[PDB]
Amino acid sequence: AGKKVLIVYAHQEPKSFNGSLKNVAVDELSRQGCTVTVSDLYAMNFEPRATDKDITGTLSNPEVFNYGVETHEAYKQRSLASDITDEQKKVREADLVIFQFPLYWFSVPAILKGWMDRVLCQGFAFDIPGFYDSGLLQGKLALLSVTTGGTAEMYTKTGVNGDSRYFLWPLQHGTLHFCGFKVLAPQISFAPEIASEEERKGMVAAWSQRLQTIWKEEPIPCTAHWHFGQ
Amino acid sequence: AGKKVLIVYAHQEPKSFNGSLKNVAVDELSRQGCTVTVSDLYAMNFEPRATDKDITGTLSNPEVFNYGVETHEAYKQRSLASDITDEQKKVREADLVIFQFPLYWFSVPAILKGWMDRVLCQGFAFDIPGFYDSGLLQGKLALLSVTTGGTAEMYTKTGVNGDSRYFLWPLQHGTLHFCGFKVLAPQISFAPEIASEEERKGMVAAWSQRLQTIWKEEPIPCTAHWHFGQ
Ligand SMILES: Cc1cc2nc3c(=O)[nH]c(=O)nc-3n(C[C@H](O)[C@H](O)[C@H](O)COP(=O)(O)OP(=O)(O)OC[C@H]3O[C@@H](n4cnc5c(N)ncnc54)[C@H](O)[C@@H]3O)c2cc1C
Ligand SMILES: Cc1cc2nc3c(=O)[nH]c(=O)nc-3n(C[C@H](O)[C@H](O)[C@H](O)COP(=O)(O)OP(=O)(O)OC[C@H]3O[C@@H](n4cnc5c(N)ncnc54)[C@H](O)[C@@H]3O)c2cc1C
Ligand SMILES: CN(C)c1nc2c(Br)c(Br)c(Br)c(Br)c2[nH]1
Ligand SMILES: CN(C)c1nc2c(Br)c(Br)c(Br)c(Br)c2[nH]1
Ligand SMILES: [Zn+2]
Ligand SMILES: [Zn+2]
Numbered sequence: 001a002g003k004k005v006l007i008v009y010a011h012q013e014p015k016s017f018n019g020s021l022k023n024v025a026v027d028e029l030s031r032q033g034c035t036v037t038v039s040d041l042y043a044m045n046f047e048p049r050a051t052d053k054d055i056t057g058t059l060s061n062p063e064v065f066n067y068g069v070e071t072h073e074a075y076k077q078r079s080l081a082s083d084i085t086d087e088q089k090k091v092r093e094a095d096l097v098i099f100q101f102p103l104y105w106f107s108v109p110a111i112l113k114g115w116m117d118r119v120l121c122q123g124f125a126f127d128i129p130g131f132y133d134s135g136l137l138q139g140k141l142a143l144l145s146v147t148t149g150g151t152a153e154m155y156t157k158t159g160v161n162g163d164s165r166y167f168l169w170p171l172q173h174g175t176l177h178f179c180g181f182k183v184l185a186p187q188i189s190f191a192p193e194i195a196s197e198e199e200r201k202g203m204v205a206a207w208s209q210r211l212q213t214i215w216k217e218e219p220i221p222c223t224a225h226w227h228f229g230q
Numbered sequence: 231a232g233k234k235v236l237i238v239y240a241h242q243e244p245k246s247f248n249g250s251l252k253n254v255a256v257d258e259l260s261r262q263g264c265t266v267t268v269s270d271l272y273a274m275n276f277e278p279r280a281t282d283k284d285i286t287g288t289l290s291n292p293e294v295f296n297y298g299v300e301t302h303e304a305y306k307q308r309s310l311a312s313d314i315t316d317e318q319k320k321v322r323e324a325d326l327v328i329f330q331f332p333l334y335w336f337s338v339p340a341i342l343k344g345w346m347d348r349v350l351c352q353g354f355a356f357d358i359p360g361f362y363d364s365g366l367l368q369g370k371l372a373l374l375s376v377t378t379g380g381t382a383e384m385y386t387k388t389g390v391n392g393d394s395r396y397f398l399w400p401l402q403h404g405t406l407h408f409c410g411f412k413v414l415a416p417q418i419s420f421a422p423e424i425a426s427e428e429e430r431k432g433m434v435a436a437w438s439q440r441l442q443t444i445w446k447e448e449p450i451p452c453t454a455h456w457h458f459g460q
Contacts, residue, residue, distance in 0.1 A: 012295050015294045048343075050334075050340070050341075051242060067242060104343075106403075106405065110279060110343035110344035113337065113344075114340035116335050149298075167399060170337050173336075174337075175335045227396075228396070
């Protein structure tokens, strides 16, 4: 009772399959009585580039620009750009962060990569200490809901693309785990464009139905063994 | 027949360790008599977002925007935004493409992700069919020159980050190999921020040194086994 969800959504088209997955997430979580917020990156024209614009006022060292340093200091000094801080407030308040995106080059689209780069700064998402199991967003759940062009068969250990778990590593382990998230099993909706309409509805319904019991879920063991082992 | 090299460079600060590695590449490849071009993405204010601004002509379906479909058709029609085709010309003429970047979240900075997303469109970099070993950039070489915050020890199988090769998969296999590139072994310069002055210049000289014999190298076998063992 009282769970808060942030959906970070990265697709250009409301009528897309990604749009539909985001919308049933909103519908079903709202129905449950959850607090729901959506960051529609393309609609926000979210800035992906890590630049000195991300620090307002006076730079900690305006002769040699070091993004990591400058943003760490700016966070501690409440001097980050407001597009970034707006996102951090949403994340701070959320118990669950769902990312909804089409797979671009075995990864997130650049606009969402930019969100990760700029929003998850040191002092906010991680520090020394406080990473992996002890990262600063510990307590929070994160979940990747990804759509692919490639079929499930292509994403097997012997398929052309390798196991889908292989490309999850930088996202689930290198990013989410690192910051302290417990990582819920990814939702992977394989090749909607190729699948039939029965199959497509089946995937949307799978997602809607999964959302019904999302708060009862055990998070994966976010390990090398999980991603690459047998 | 002499060689042409494109360096796609992604760092905000000319005096950075990445800047030094980039300039050493230019110096040494130039010294050899190679033709050298550098895409300095931050200096170019390179657009990372995949949006409908990337097509200028009549859309194939203006009611439901599909980025992949519209960019493929626009490539064939020659109605892609000019910043995209400017990059394509550089890649088309290159024998070797070197990517110089700091590791951001086990991956490329978003501005460089955007270059991959927007530049390597269907029809130019791959076709269906016409991918992986049949990719359209076959005959070309690619090399990732990466700098990390993490130490080499952290990037081992039993280290907290897992092996360094693990995070290369989406880039080397999912992107470069997919487009037909043969992939030269990565240059990873670990933890320059932690390093001593000597170790720093030693990492820069090691890269310069490698480049002296780059045209003698064979590519890696860009397979699951190379990346993950088993
Ligand atoms: C730059 C780029 C890089 C890419 N790299 C990769 C890669 O590395 N690997 C890979 O596998 N793929 C890759 N892709 C392909 C991409 O992942 C897929 O095209 C994308 O995931 C498809 O999702 P979508 O939301 O755009 O589908 P859509 O085309 O928008 O939807 C598919 C169909 O489902 C229909 N639909 C929508 N809503 C519903 C609903 N509620 N119920 C039933 N049907 C519905 C739509 O109308 C549509 O006809 C890449 C694509 C691009 C553009
Ligand atoms: C958003 C973000 C996400 C990140 N995610 C990760 C991650 O997932 N994993 C990870 O391991 N790291 C990560 N990092 C860390 C990042 O990879 C490192 O900070 C970066 O790789 C260091 O490279 P640099 O060029 O900025 O180093 P610099 O700070 O520019 O270089 C270090 C030192 O080298 C000196 N130097 C420059 N040129 C020379 C020279 N020619 N000779 C000697 N010394 C020289 C510089 O003056 C400086 O003092 C992340 C950083 C950011 C900002
Ligand atoms: C639009 N569409 C059907 C589409 N675009 C794709 C791109 Br770009 C890549 Br890269 C891959 Br891999 C696949 Br599969 C794609 N499918
Ligand atoms: C600036 N600096 C030294 C720095 N910034 C880092 C970031 Br951001 C991440 Br995420 C990681 Br992981 C490491 Br290691 C980093 N080291
Ligand atoms: Zn993990
Ligand atoms: Zn490969």
